[PDB]
């Protein structure tokens, strides 16, 4: 069944065809669209896209909106893709989890906009396109698979280029050693609290984060005699039992 | 090298020990320093048992003015403890093939020195002696696989 | 010493049904002894009348060869009716509820005077036995005809302990007076007086019979028939003495039947020769003695377990056949004499019989080791194994008890063709030595095979299979024209438990050479003939020998059995063993120079790879670096002898071509504190190694991969050095600041990601830290367990054919496959590729997850997991199965001393794949226990898929890969630029893993990774299947937490977009995939 394209609480079906396979003799993929406007830097006016397909890089999405501007003259400043976790690789950030420096919804994507007229025009254009595909599935603008996966992801057996990862290792270690000596000097200066207090720091500790984590991780003598009442109660114990 | 298998007018030998020549350790010992020595009775990843020794001589640093550089004997206990721990960890985690391959390029020595250089300097750590004590069984296939 | 007593009690509670099914058969025996009491007599007559007496009746008279003629039989019979009793097992009250049908003994003894005191000639003693039983059979048939019990009972001639000279009559209860619930067969033997003889001619070496060769079966069977109540009397004396004999009897006889020593026979080519009665009377022998100084070892008061222990220890350690035995006098102590009798031997002076002569030499030699092994698994206080002591059944199967078995097809025809077919001697002295062709042939075939193998086998067993221990009323013995003979088999199966060190030694040498030839060199040359020759060796040794040819598919022990069977046994016999060819052909034959003649225990391809690694190892140590290299040690499956194709030079597409090797530098205190800059430093060291190695050692080629197998750090760039010997190595850098950095991530992770990063740390520990001791222990243990590397290569080809090796880890496969070796109970150590693989399958079926773990210690036979370590891994197993008692995410618990946590190798695999594994286990052992071993059995046993796997996605590849993957049906180069390995290798494994990583919640995928070990004889056929989750079975509403492909038809429900998922599958693998099918 075709004719429906608008779900119950803020969702849009976006269908589009798929190319020829030799062994598939109506193959159609969907997007779930939902706008949301938040008060943050990148969380403002983004479309939550559920089930954007396999290996959704920037080039065919830019081509998608370019043919949209070539069909219905719709202005859209879309050159970015945020939260694009296809396989499930970057759910955690292990560098920020192991150390302080060089730092500081599932199967969705962010398609973020700039203007109210921009998100309005693209939104009612996509709602009009969902409704006209619900009326006729024949003459939508269709996807040209100018395959990004065959170049941008076919690297599983490729040798890494020597000068490229040489220079990446070099620049990374340059900026790491620079901010590591910065993070050492900023603790081996004098840290005097505003009231009167100077912070005890070890000889070779080189950060404050490790210190406060050591705080977070590190969150009587005798006698049974020698007093008048203690020898008195011991005599009472030998009388008792 | 102890002869164990013999075939084809050859002798098929296995690692049975390691020593120093006496003039080596006599070329090492000089007064006004302390020699720390350790020895452990360890079992490798086989059922071989080894008594493996170690000697290590206290060093005077560069910019040291006083002539002695003796150890304070609490430092001797701490150094002998870290040495016994590190060579009983370097065995039990090696075979005799892996341990002979370990003490060819003297690398347990650099392990000891890097483990020890926050107690005392300690010039020329050596192992000086590896003694076989008891051997498991024969295992001719392992002997032939060791040879090739 | 707390659960063995409850095992004893629960075993007796499960084998005791002795109140209802005993009284009815008791009263039926009461009616039967009244029947034989009212049987009438039969006065003195002779054979000349009794042949025509039994001519045209219904009941025939049994005999032994030849039919007794009125020339030599001027013999007359007397019919005196004796007293009846209960004898043996029922006399000592230890019957067993085997549903196969047990026995009971009937006493028909004889008076002293009806049969003369001259029983030492030409078996007319058993001939008058045969005529007495024949007319009593006839008149019992008439008495049941008059008492109307004709319909449900059937009186049948059968074999008393398979003995061809003592036939008996058994009631079968065939289909208020009916009998169809408890056991079936009821025996009928006759007995004799105790004193019918002379003492000096009852020893097993005498002779008086026709043409001085002795006759053990004659002077044993006559005295066995003599003694059927003196045994009972002194067994009643020791039963009144000790209060543990009934429980000792049921325990030891259950031991004996679950390891196959039932009281059938051994002489006639049968597995057995020993049983309950023999066990109990040697137990009473050990009770009354055992010591040279009249030392008693068995006290007549203590329990069942210590009695079983003492008698199993004694008959396990003290010899009885080859040198020495012990005797006892019943009417009382025992003594040890050092004089071997070349039979399993124990003697009396009250019955004066050698008891164990129903057992042969081979069956005794295997009995002693069965007792020694069960002793050795009684004296381990670490594990509890009373399943493996009593409850398991090893003699229910045919090819798990024995590593090799050959079908000696013997189409030797009739007795007029016996001379011109059988190459041995048959005649008169051998017919007075052995009784028939069956027991003579058993003795001769086992002696010929034992001499022709000798030091190449541990023990031998001989089976005249198809042996019919019953024959109907209208015939005097077995009429059987059964596949080319007239005897009581159809073919023979010779079975071998072998010495795996001496299987593929291609010289079985004889004695040394001299001027005058020895008896030993003489019998060596009379044995081998055209193979017997004189050779000098490299060590200067002139010896007689016979040099064979090694082959991969045919182990040379098979060619020895073929040669010494087609020469010294027959000249037209056949030997059949094709299951071994099937298995050894399933192992991929490598593209090596003359690799078809190389044996399956030849590891020299691994050894050549290790030699190239030794070269690269010395090059890396001799180069100079910013840190001293602490240690560079390999961790690869090829270095622990596990790699599927044994590695040929220049095999790009071989997935185990790039071997893994962990190098560590010295403990530097200058490693960074942050993980990605740490990995950039580790790869900075690897780039320095690359630059120095390409600068100096110019024949080595090297490039960089990018490893992603440890999650959440996408920069572990291990370089790939391609050596000039045609090998490649993956170099990892272990630093001491790695494990503490990952434990730091565990420490400061957010509280919803702690099992997530703990699984990540489990992957890191499985790759870097524990795999090193894993390959160390498997490399040291493969040299003491010989067939282990080919059975793992078969097991991994099996897993890859059933397309589960993409998920299940190789280390897990190696530990489940090392279980039948490092604790084999109660089987022996596997001496065959076939026995290893079938016992792996039997263990993975018989083993249950939810209650029992896989705690095993990888050591050499004769460092051990102690009671403390064992109870610790038992404790953390119970903790895992209290936190999850049904195995949701942790399905297998395989654990060792090398890793006691268990979850390391068996985490991460889905419950669909684990259930498929245990299902295929039970399916395989079910088909092996139904059908039996044939070529079509092994063909389906390696036939993939074709089951409830929901998808079939068939792929190709633009070039075949098997010339360039080393399984032969040549590349000896490397490409000028190293971007051609990318097109040479196959992508399907990591493409399927990427697809399963992106589809972890909707469907699991599965595929094969070694492409042309399962993909045809060309090497292109790969398949993908999928299994949809039990969560995505219907049509649910969309949520934030669906993680699926959406396709709503209404506004409420959402369904899968299946067509789009496999359209983008083919758009992902478009050059490779060719077809799609929905189961």
Swiss-Prot record, chain A:
Gene Ontology terms for molecular function: rRNA binding
Name of the featured protein: Ribosomal RNA-processing protein 7
Function: Plays an important role in the synthesis of 18S rRNA but is not required for the 5.8S and 25S pathway. Is necessary for the cleavage at site A2. Is required for efficient association of RPS27 with the pre-ribosomal particle.
Predominant location: nucleus
Origin: domain of life: Eukaryota
GO annotation, cellular component aspect: CURI complex; nucleolus; nucleoplasm; nucleus; small-subunit processome; UTP-C complex
Coiled-coil blocks: none
Transmembrane segments: none
Curated annotation (Swiss-Prot), chain B:
Presence of keyword Ubl conjugation: yes
Gene Ontology biological process terms in this record: cytoplasmic translation; maturation of SSU-rRNA from tricistronic rRNA transcript (SSU-rRNA, 5.8S rRNA, LSU-rRNA)
Record localization: Cytoplasm
Molecular function GO labels: structural constituent of ribosome
Signal peptide segment: none
PTM description: N-terminally acetylated by acetyltransferase NatA.
Subunit details: Component of the small ribosomal subunit (SSU). Mature yeast ribosomes consist of a small (40S) and a large (60S) subunit. The 40S small subunit contains 1 molecule of ribosomal RNA (18S rRNA) and 33 different proteins (encoded by 57 genes). The large 60S subunit contains 3 rRNA molecules (25S, 5.8S and 5S rRNA) and 46 different proteins (encoded by 81 genes). eS1 interacts directly with uS11 and eS26, which form part of the mRNA exit tunnel.
Miscellaneous note of the record: Present with 92400 molecules/cell in log phase SD medium. There are 2 genes for eS1 in yeast.
Function field: Component of the ribosome, a large ribonucleoprotein complex responsible for the synthesis of proteins in the cell. The small ribosomal subunit (SSU) binds messenger RNAs (mRNAs) and translates the encoded message by selecting cognate aminoacyl-transfer RNA (tRNA) molecules. The large subunit (LSU) contains the ribosomal catalytic site termed the peptidyl transferase center (PTC), which catalyzes the formation of peptide bonds, thereby polymerizing the amino acids delivered by tRNAs into a polypeptide chain.
Record's protein name: Small ribosomal subunit protein eS1A
Annotated organism of origin: Saccharomyces cerevisiae (strain ATCC 204508 / S288c)
Lineage: Eukaryota, Fungi, Dikarya, Ascomycota, Saccharomycotina
The gene coding this protein: RPS1A
Curated annotation (Swiss-Prot), chain C:
Cellular component, GO annotation: 90S preribosome; CURI complex; nucleolus; nucleoplasm; nucleus; small-subunit processome; UTP-C complex
Cell compartments where the protein resides: Nucleus, Nucleolus
Residues forming coiled coils: none
Gene3D superfamilies registered for this protein in UniProt: 1.10.1410.10, 3.30.70.3020, 3.30.70.3030
Alphabetical UniProt keywords: Nucleus, Phosphoprotein, Ribonucleoprotein, Ribosome biogenesis, RNA-binding, rRNA processing
UniProt-listed GO biological process terms: maturation of SSU-rRNA; nucleolar large rRNA transcription by RNA polymerase I; regulation of ribosomal protein gene transcription by RNA polymerase II; ribosomal small subunit assembly; rRNA processing; tRNA export from nucleus
Pfam families, per database record: Nrap (PF03813), Nrap_D2 (PF17403), Nrap_D3 (PF17404), Nrap_D4 (PF17405), Nrap_D5 (PF17406), Nrap_D6 (PF17407)
Keyword Phosphoprotein attached: yes
Family: Belongs to the NRAP family.
Quaternary assembly: Interacts with snoRNA U3. Interacts with MPP10. Component of the ribosomal small subunit (SSU) processome composed of at least 40 protein subunits and snoRNA U3. Interacts with UBP10.
Summary of the function given for this chain in its UniProt record: Involved in nucleolar processing of pre-18S ribosomal RNA and ribosome assembly.
Additional notes on this entry: Present with 3260 molecules/cell in log phase SD medium.
Record's protein name: U3 small nucleolar RNA-associated protein 22
Lineage: Eukaryota, Fungi, Dikarya, Ascomycota, Saccharomycotina
């Amino acid at each position: 069944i075709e004719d429906i394209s608008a779900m119950k609480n803020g969702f849009i079906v976006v269908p589009f065809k798929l190319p020829d396979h030799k062994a598939l003799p109506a193959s159609l993929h969907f997007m779930f669209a939902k706008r949301h406007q938040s008060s943050n830097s990148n969380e403002s006016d983004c479309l939550f896209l559920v089930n954007l397909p396999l290996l959704s890089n920037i080039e065919h999405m830019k081509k998608f909106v370019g043919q949209l501007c070539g069909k219905y003259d719709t202005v859209s400043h879309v050159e970015e893709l945020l939260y694009n976790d296809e396989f499930g690789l970057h759910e955690v950030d292990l560098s920020a989890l192991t150390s302080d420096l060089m730092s500081s919804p599932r199967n969705t994507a962010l398609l973020k906009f700039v203007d109210a007229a921009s998100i309005n025009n693209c939104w009612n254009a996509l709602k009009k396109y969902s409704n006209l595909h619900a009326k006729h599935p024949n003459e939508l603008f269709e996807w040209t698979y100018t395959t990004p996966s065959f170049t941008t992801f076919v690297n599983f057996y490729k040798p890494l280029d020597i000068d490229y990862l040489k220079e990446d290792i070099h620049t990374h270690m340059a900026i790491f050693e620079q901010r590591e000596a910065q993070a050492q000097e900023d603790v081996q200066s004098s840290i005097v609290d505003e009231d009167g207090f100077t912070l005890v720091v070890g000889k070779n500790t080189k950060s404050l984060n490790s210190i406060r984590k050591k705080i977070l991780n590190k969150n009587k003598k005798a006698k049974k005699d020698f007093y008048r009442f203690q020898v008195r109660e011991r005599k009472k114990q030998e009388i008792n039992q | 090298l102890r002869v164990d298998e013999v075939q084809g007018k050859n002798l098929l030998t296995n690692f049975h020990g390691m020593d120093f020549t006496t003039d080596k350790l006599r070329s090492m010992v000089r007064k006004w320093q302390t020699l720390i020595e350790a020895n452990v009775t360890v079992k490798t990843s086989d059922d071989y048992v080894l008594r493996i020794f170690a000697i290590a001589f206290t060093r005077k640093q560069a910019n040291q003015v006083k002539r002695h550089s003796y150890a304070q004997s609490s430092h001797i206990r701490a150094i002998r403890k870290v040495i016994s721990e590190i060579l009983t960890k370097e065995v039990q985690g090696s075979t005799l093939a892996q341990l002979t391959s370990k003490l060819i390029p003297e690398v347990i020595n650099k392990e000891i020195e890097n483990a020890t250089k926050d107690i005392f300097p300690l010039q020329n750590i050596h192992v000086r002696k590896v003694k076989l004590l008891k051997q498991p069984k024969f295992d001719v296939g392992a002997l032939m696989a060791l040879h090739g | 010493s707390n659960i063995f007593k409850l095992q004893i009690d629960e075993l007796l509670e499960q084998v005791k049904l002795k109140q209802k099914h005993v009284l009815k058969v008791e009263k039926f025996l009461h009616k039967l002894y009244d029947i034989l009491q009212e049987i009438p007599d039969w006065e003195e007559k002779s054979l000349a009348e009794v042949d025509s007496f039994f001519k045209n009746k219904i009941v025939s008279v049994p005999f032994v060869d030849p039919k007794p003629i009125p020339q030599n039989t001027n013999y007359k019979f007397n019919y005196k009716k004796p007293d009846i009793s209960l004898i043996g097992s029922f006399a000592l009250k230890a019957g067993i509820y085997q549903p196969n049908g047990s026995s009971i003994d009937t006493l028909l003894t004889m008076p002293k005077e009806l049969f003369e005191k001259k029983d030492f000639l030409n078996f007319r003693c058993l001939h008058k036995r045969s005529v007495y039983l024949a007319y009593l059979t006839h008149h019992l048939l008439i008495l049941l005809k008059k008492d109307k019990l004709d319909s449900f009972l059937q009186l049948e001639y059968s074999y008393f302990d398979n003995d061809p000279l003592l036939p008996i009559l058994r009631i079968s209860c065939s289909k208020d007076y009916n009998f169809y619930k408890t056991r079936f067969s009821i025996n009928l033997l006759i007995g004799f007086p105790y004193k019918v003889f002379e003492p000096k001619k009852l020893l097993p070496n005498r002779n008086c019979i026709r043409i001085l060769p002795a006759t053990p079966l004659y002077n044993f069977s006559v005295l066995s028939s003599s003694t059927h109540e003196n045994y009972l009397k002194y067994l009643y004396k020791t039963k009144k003495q000790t209060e543990s004999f009934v429980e000792a009897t049921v325990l030891g006889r259950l031991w004996l039947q679950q390891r196959g020593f039932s009281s059938n026979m051994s002489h006639s080519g049968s597995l057995g020769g020993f049983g309950t009665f023999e066990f109990t009377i040697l137990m009473a022998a050990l009770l009354n003695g055992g010591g040279i100084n009249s030392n008693k070892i068995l006290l007549h008061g203590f329990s069942s377990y210590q009695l079983f222990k003492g008698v199993i220890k004694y008959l396990a350690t003290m010899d009885l056949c080859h040198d020495g035995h012990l005797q006892f006098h019943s009417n009382p102590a025992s003594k040890y004499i050092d004089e071997g009798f070349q039979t399993p031997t124990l003697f009396d002076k009250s019955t004066k019989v050698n008891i164990l002569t129903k057992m042969t030499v081979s069956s005794y030699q295997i009995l002693k080791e069965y007792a020694g092994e069960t002793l050795r698994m009684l004296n381990n206080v670490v594990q509890d194994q009373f399943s493996n002591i009593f409850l398991t059944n090893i003699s229910r199967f045919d090819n798990l008890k024995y590593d090799l078995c050959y079908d000696v097809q013997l189409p030797l025809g009739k007795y007029n063709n016996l001379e011109t077919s059988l190459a041995a001697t048959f005649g008169s002295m051998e017919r007075v030595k052995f009784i028939t062709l069956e027991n003579f042939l058993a003795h001769k075939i086992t002696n010929v095979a034992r001499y022709a193998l000798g030091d190449r086998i541990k023990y031998i067993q001989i089976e005249m299979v198809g042996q019919k221990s019953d024959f109907p009323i209208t015939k005097r013995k077995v009429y059987s024209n059964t596949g080319g003979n007239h005897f009581n088999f159809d073919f023979v199966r010779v079975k071998l438990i072998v010495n795996p060190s001496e299987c593929d030694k291609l010289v079985t040498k004889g004695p040394a050479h001299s001027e005058t030839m020895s008896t030993e060199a003489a019998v060596f040359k009379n044995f081998w003939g055209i193979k017997s020759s004189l050779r000098r060796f490299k060590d200067g040794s002139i010896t007689h020998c016979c040099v064979w040819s090694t082959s991969s598919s045919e182990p040379i022990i098979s060619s020895i059995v073929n040669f010494a069977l087609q020469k010294h046994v027959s000249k037209k016999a056949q030997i059949s063993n094709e299951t071994i060819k099937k298995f050894h052909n399933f192992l991929p034959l490598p593209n090596l120079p003359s690799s078809a003649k190389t044996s399956v225990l030849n590891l020299s391809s691994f050894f050549n790879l290790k030699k190239s690694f030794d070269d690269l190892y010395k090059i890396i140590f001799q180069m100079k670096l910013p840190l001293s290299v602490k240690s560079i040690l390999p961790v690869g499956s090829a270095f622990r002898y596990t790699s599927l194709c044994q590695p040929v030079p220049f095999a790009y597409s071989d997935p185990d071509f790039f071997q893994d090797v962990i190098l560590e530098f010295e403990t530097s205190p200058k490693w960074p504190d942050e993980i990605t800059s740490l990995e950039k430093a580790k790869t900075a060291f690897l780039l320095k190694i690359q630059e120095e190695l390409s600068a100096n050692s110019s024949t080595y080629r090297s490039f960089f991969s990018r490893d992603e197998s440890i999650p959440y750090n996408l920069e572990i760039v291990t370089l790939n050095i391609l050596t000039p010997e045609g090998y490649g190595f993956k170099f990892r850098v272990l630093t001491e600041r790695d494990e503490i950095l990952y434990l730091r991530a565990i420490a400061n992770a957010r509280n919803e990601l702690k099992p997530e990063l703990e699984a990540t740390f489990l992957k890191f520990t499985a790759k870097y830290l524990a795999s090193v001791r894993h390959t160390r222990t498997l490399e040291n243990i493969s040299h003491s367990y010989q067939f282990y590397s080919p059975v793992v290569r078969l097991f991994k080809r099996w897993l890859d054919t059933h397309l589960l090796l993409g998920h299940i880890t190789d280390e897990l496969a190696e530990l489940i496959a090392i279980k039948p070796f490092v604790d084999p109970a109660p089987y022996f150590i596997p001496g065959s590729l076939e026995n290893g693989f079938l016992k792996v399958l039997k263990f993975i079926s018989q083993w249950n997850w939810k209650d029992d773990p896989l705690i095993l210690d990888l050591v050499k036979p004769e460092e051990r997991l102690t009671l403390a370590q064992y109870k610790g891994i038992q404790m953390n197993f119970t903790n895992l199965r209290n936190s999850d008692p049904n195995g949701t995410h942790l399905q297998f618990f395989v654990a060792s001393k090398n890793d006691p946590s268990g979850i390391l190798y068996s985490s991460g695999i889905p419950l669909p794949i684990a259930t498929r594994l245990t299902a295929l286990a039970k399916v395989a052992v079910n088909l092996l226990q139904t059908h039996g071993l044939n070529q079509q059995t092994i063909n389906l046993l390696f036939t993939p898929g074709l089951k409830d796997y929901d998808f079939v996605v068939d792929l190709r590849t633009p070039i075949g890969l098997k010339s360039s993957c080393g399984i032969l049906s040549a590349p000896s180069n490397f490409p000028e630029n190293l971007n051609d390995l990318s097109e040479k290798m196959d992508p399907t494994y990591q493409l399927v893993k990427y697809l399963n990583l992106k589809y972890k919640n909707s469907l699991i995928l599965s595929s094969r990774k070694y492409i042309g070990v399962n993909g045809g004889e060309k090497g292109d056929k790969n398949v993908i299947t999928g299994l949809i989750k039990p969560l995505f079975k219907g049509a649910h509403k969309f949520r934030v937490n669906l993680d699926c492909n959406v396709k709503p038809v209404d506004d409420e429900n959402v369904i899968l977009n299946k067509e789009a998922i496999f359209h983008e599958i083919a758009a992902f693998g478009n050059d490779m995939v060719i077809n799609f099918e929905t189961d």
